[PDB]
Amino acid sequence: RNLRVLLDTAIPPSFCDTVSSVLLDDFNMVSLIRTSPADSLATIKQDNAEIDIAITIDEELKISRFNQCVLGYTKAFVVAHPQHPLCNASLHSIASLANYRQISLGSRSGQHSNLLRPVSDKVLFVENFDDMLRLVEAGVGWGIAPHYFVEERLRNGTLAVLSELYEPGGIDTKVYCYYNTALESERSFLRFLESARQRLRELGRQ
Numbered sequence: 001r002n003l004r005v006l007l008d009t010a011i012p013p014s015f016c017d018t019v020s021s022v023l024l025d026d027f028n029m030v031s032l033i034r035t036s037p038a039d040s041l042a043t044i045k046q047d048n049a050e051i052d053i054a055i056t057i058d059e060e061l062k063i064s065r066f067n068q069c070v071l072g073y074t075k076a077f078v079v080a081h082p083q084h085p086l087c088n089a090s091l092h093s094i095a096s097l098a099n100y101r102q103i104s105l106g107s108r109s110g111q112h113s114n115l116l117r118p119v120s121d122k123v124l125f126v127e128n129f130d131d132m133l134r135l136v137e138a139g140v141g142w143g144i145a146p147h148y149f150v151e152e153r154l155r156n157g158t159l160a161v162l163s164e165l166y167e168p169g170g171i172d173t174k175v176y177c178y179y180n181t182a183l184e185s186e187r188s189f190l191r192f193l194e195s196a197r198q199r200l201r202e203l204g205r206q
């Protein structure tokens with residue numbers, strides 16, 4: 001009937017709004033929460049919070065009271081400041097990157113998903129992407145960010161990309177939809193999945 005829905009901050013706005021309208025058509029009351037992917041799963045697991053659907057890039061199989069399925073995809077970029085050493089290098093390996101400071105989401109204390117697990121031994125953590133980019137643009141290091149976030153800075157030369165040999169066009173990242181088990185049998189939920197997936201496909205095409 002009613003729904004509390006979490007969407008992590010790597011899910012682009014177009015994607016969010018898509019999920020929003022589908023859920024508002026197929027459900028009654030809809031509430032949204034936004035969190036960094038580092039805190040996405042960590043949030044829903046709290047028995048205290050009552051989140052019924054959670055849409056995030058963070059991977060985790062067997063979570064209590066929740067299912068998993070794939071809703072769509074999003075693309076992320078390895079970015080650094082344009083005069084950063086790694087940009088004047090052209091060549092790319094994960095070791096070349098590991099010898100420099102990563103600016104990464106998450107808190108050092110705690111189980112870091114293999115997704116947000118820093119690659120460098122020299123890391124500097126942040127709470128959100130705004131802060132991450134503050135440091136990157138100040139040449140303090142390099143980071144991983146959503147496309148929608150850094151599109152602007154890349155258009156404007158503010159910011160470079162280090163991932164264009166690894167995966168041209170950025171790094172495809174699954175978007176998982178962890179759904180409370182009680183919804184498995186709700187035809188409203190199944191309709192939502194169907195419609196949101198179709199729309200997101202038509203959108204990814206564009």
Ligand SMILES: FC(F)(F)c1cc(NCc2cnc(-c3ccc(Oc4ccccc4)cc3)s2)ccn1
Pocket residue numbers: 010037057075076077078092093094097115116119144145146147162163164165166171173
């Ligand atoms: F949310 C968000 F921001 F999109 C986001 C998505 C994520 N997805 C999974 C990945 C985690 N590490 C990825 C990665 C890192 C460094 C790479 O370096 C290079 C460079 C050039 C040649 C070879 C290797 C390549 C791939 S991909 C992770 C974190 N954050």
